[PDB]
Amino acid sequence: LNLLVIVVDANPIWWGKQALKESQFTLSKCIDAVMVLGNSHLFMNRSNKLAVIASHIQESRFLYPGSKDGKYELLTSANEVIVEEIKDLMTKSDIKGQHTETLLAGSLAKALCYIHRMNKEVKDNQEMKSRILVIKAAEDSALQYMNFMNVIFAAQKQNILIDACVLDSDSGLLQQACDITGGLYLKVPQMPSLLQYLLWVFLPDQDQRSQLILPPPVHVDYRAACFCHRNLIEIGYVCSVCLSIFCNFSPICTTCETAFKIS
Amino acid sequence: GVLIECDPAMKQFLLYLDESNALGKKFIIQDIDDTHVFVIAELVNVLQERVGEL
Amino acid sequence: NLQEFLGGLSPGVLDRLYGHPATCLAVFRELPSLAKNWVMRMLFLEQPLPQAAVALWVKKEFSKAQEESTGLLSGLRIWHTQLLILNPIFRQNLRIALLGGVPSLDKYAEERWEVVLHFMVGSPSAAVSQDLAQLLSQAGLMKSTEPGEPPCITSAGFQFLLLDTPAQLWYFMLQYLQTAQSRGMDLVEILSFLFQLSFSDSLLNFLQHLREFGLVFQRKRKSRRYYPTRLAINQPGFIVVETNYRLYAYTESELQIALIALFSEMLYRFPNMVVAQVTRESVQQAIASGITAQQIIHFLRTRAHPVMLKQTPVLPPTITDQIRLWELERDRLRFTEGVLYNQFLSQVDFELLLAHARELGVLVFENSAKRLMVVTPAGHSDVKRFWKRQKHSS
Amino acid sequence: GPTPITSQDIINSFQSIRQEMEAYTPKLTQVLSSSAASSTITALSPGGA
Numbered sequence A: 001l002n003l004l005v006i007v008v009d010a011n012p013i014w015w016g017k018q019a020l021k022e023s024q025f026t027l028s029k030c031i032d033a034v035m036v037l038g039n040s041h042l043f044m045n046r047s048n049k050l051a052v053i054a055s056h057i058q059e060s061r062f063l064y065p066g067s068k069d070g071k072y073e074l075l076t077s078a079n080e081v082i083v084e085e086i087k088d089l090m091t092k093s094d095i096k097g098q099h100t101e102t103l104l105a106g107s108l109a110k111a112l113c114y115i116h117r118m119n120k121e122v123k124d125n126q127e128m129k130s131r132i133l134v135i136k137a138a139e140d141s142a143l144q145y146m147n148f149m150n151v152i153f154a155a156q157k158q159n160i161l162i163d164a165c166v167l168d169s170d171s172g173l174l175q176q177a178c179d180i181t182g183g184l185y186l187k188v189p190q191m192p193s194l195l196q197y198l199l200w201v202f203l204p205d206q207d208q209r210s211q212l213i214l215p216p217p218v219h220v221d222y223r224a225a226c227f228c229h230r231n232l233i234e235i236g237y238v239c240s241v242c243l244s245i246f247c248n249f250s251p252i253c254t255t256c257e258t259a260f261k262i263s
Numbered sequence B: 001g002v003l004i005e006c007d008p009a010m011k012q013f014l015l016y017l018d019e020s021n022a023l024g025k026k027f028i029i030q031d032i033d034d035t036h037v038f039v040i041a042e043l044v045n046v047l048q049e050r051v052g053e054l
Numbered sequence C: 001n002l003q004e005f006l007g008g009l010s011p012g013v014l015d016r017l018y019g020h021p022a023t024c025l026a027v028f029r030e031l032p033s034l035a036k037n038w039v040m041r042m043l044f045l046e047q048p049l050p051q052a053a054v055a056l057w058v059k060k061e062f063s064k065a066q067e068e069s070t071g072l073l074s075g076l077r078i079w080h081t082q083l084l085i086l087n088p089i090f091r092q093n094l095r096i097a098l099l100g101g102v103p104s105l106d107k108y109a110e111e112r113w114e115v116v117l118h119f120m121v122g123s124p125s126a127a128v129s130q131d132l133a134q135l136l137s138q139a140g141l142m143k144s145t146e147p148g149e150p151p152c153i154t155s156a157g158f159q160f161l162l163l164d165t166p167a168q169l170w171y172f173m174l175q176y177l178q179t180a181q182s183r184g185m186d187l188v189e190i191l192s193f194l195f196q197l198s199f200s201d202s203l204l205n206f207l208q209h210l211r212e213f214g215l216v217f218q219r220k221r222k223s224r225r226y227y228p229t230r231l232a233i234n235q236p237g238f239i240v241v242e243t244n245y246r247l248y249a250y251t252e253s254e255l256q257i258a259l260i261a262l263f264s265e266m267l268y269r270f271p272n273m274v275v276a277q278v279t280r281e282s283v284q285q286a287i288a289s290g291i292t293a294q295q296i297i298h299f300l301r302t303r304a305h306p307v308m309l310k311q312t313p314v315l316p317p318t319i320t321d322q323i324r325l326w327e328l329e330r331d332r333l334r335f336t337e338g339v340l341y342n343q344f345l346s347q348v349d350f351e352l353l354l355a356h357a358r359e360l361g362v363l364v365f366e367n368s369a370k371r372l373m374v375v376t377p378a379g380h381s382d383v384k385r386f387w388k389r390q391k392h393s394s
Numbered sequence D: 001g002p003t004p005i006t007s008q009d010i011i012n013s014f015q016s017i018r019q020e021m022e023a024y025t026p027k028l029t030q031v032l033s034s035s036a037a038s039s040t041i042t043a044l045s046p047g048g049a
């Protein structure tokens, strides 16, 4: 079976900027597209299961743990729960000018441990191939690099595919993240037609991904820079404690304070 | 006729009954090859009794 | 299989059968691997797309999956070339199906199927039902020929008996549908209920027959609501086989003992065990009745005690080989109707006549060395005319 | 690490997005359109974007 997790980056600052701009695309339509993708994923098979996470500057919250219109009961419950919870989360939110960058590493950590919990609980008879369909919507924060890299490596070890679906911006950190675990990287330039991209590129599971034509991966610039002025460097002088990429040979690296002996 | 598929070594088993039975003119009417014989329709159930000795 | 059953249908019945509630989902689950993905893709498109795209949308490796899926779904007629947009009705129904618009039961099903099999075999005590008896008789696995005397069991009956419960029930329901069309019950309406289970007068009669089979049980004096059993949606062994053709079966239900006695000689019957011997007499008796060694071997393997599961193979080679050799020992006569010509003159002329009886379906055996073609009397008035025409052509 | 790189705007965006989603479940027609879907398929075509 397959356990899909949609990590939606519903950043109020950026999505409300779109709302003020009165652009055609809106967070409501984005949530509807994600809902349709999840419904289709579960539609694929009974054993398949899904979950949803929404990201905010403060924290990240799960959007998912009759036939009034002649509807499938389970998908109806999914629609109702996600709609109600997303509206509640968006309506209620404190204001903090100091912190405005969208948070994604914590949401991904929650997704990873949730997948681990489900893998533990599920019977050993059936093998579960989990996936994380990250949908970024705003620029990333520099200060989150370390934790995001930790969670990416944990996902690599635990065999989960991070399929990035960044839109309106190309996050180098996120493309690097999905490249490590082999997840696909699609940058949709046509936001209104986003759902067609999901039902082709992302929706097919790892089982059938190899035996299918999908957009080629984007080249990843594995840049390195010294800790002084933040610029690309091809040669780094790291020590045996900090393991920090530096500018030039120095008597002692500041982040270490070690008694380096010249020679 | 009645097409009967059999074994090459067993085809001559029904031929011996042809020269022994005096009911009609001739039992086997057309011997196609070694695994196909023909017959007036009437002795398949009787042949099942001879399986105990065959 | 259900794929065969659905493939053997016309477009007119197919589109009607694609009902809104369940059919669009039940037939979807059938899609083995990839056609699911394509159905989801082009579920939201109102514009048909070229076939070349679908052709090139699978890598060079594992293309046979692409062709087989495309052929299967073309047979199902989910889309039309229109020049590959899906059928509008199926698209709408599938969108409506995708975000749009027990312990006693299993025992009941087991007991009902067991009593049905008891009646199938010559059990003096069994459930009595004239409709069930006549249905089984017309299913092709039973023939009575005398209403006063209880019906006997035909050759196909033993083969059906020795099959496993899943395949047995599935084939029984397939025959049920085929005979439903003959008796006049609408096929689509009854078929849709089976799909709806895994999630009118004709409906009531069909549900009554299903309850008689034990798949469903209203439990409320035949109320509208029903609670399907496990078998409606669609175990350890007990026989121990020795190397001396001896079977020790931990059987308490008389059905298993009867099934074993069908092809073995019973020696002792203990309260929780029974001893039988697989001898030439019993095995050849079963083979004459109609069974073949494959069914017996499969039955013994599936009902294999856990003790003998450790050894590989589970069933001893000596027992398996002996059963196969015993079945081979018997080769049997056949029955057909035919007429034979002779004095065929030219050789190249006899080869043209062989294609006349082969296309019409009246040819049985040919002989190019003696010129000897057997023609059934059913098509004798058509072959002779052709021969006369050939003679006229000269 | 080495990876490289008004106030009233946040208030305006927050209130606007709060008022955005008073209506939900527009999936019937709003989420997708055939013309946009066809454009997406053409883009996914080898010669497309």
Ligand SMILES: [Zn+2]
Pocket (backbone or CB within 6 Å): A226, A227, A228, A229, A246, A247, A248
């Ligand atoms: Zn520097």
Ligand SMILES: [Zn+2]
Pocket (backbone or CB within 6 Å): A239, A240, A241, A242, A243, A253, A255, A256, A257, A258
């Ligand atoms: Zn250091």
